[PDB]
């Protein structure tokens, strides 16, 4: 547990990356998080929204 200041930075960077990756699963009001599922279900007039 002595090397704590070096492990803290690695843990913070890993958690930042994990949050940035998990943010790709949110919908933000849309019907699906995957863009392929939106481009294969809706038309360009309604897919932009």
């Amino acid at each position: 547990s002595a090397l704590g200041k070096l492990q803290d930075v690695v843990n913070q960077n890993a958690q930042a990356l994990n949050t940035l990756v998990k943010q790709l699963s949110s919908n933000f009001g849309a019907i699906s998080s995957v863009l392929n599922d939106i481009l294969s279900r809706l038309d360009p007039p309604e897919a932009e929204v």
Binding site: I31, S40, R41, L42, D43, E46
Partner: protein, 50 residues
């Protein structure tokens, strides 16, 4: 049927063909929600409820 006792037919294992459901001048309104009528021939749905 009426609007208070409306039938609900559970679609099952089949090969749906939405080609002639919209390309036919026999329907007054064909409003789709969540999907586009032109993409229904490419989607494989889990369960359809009429």
């Amino acid at each position: 049927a009426s609007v208070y006792a409306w039938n609900r037919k559970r679609i099952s294992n089949c090969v749906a063909d939405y080609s002639v459901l919209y390309n036919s001048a026999s329907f007054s309104t064909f409003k789709c929600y969540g999907v586009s009528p032109t993409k229904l021939n490419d989607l494989c749905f889990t369960n359809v409820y009429a």
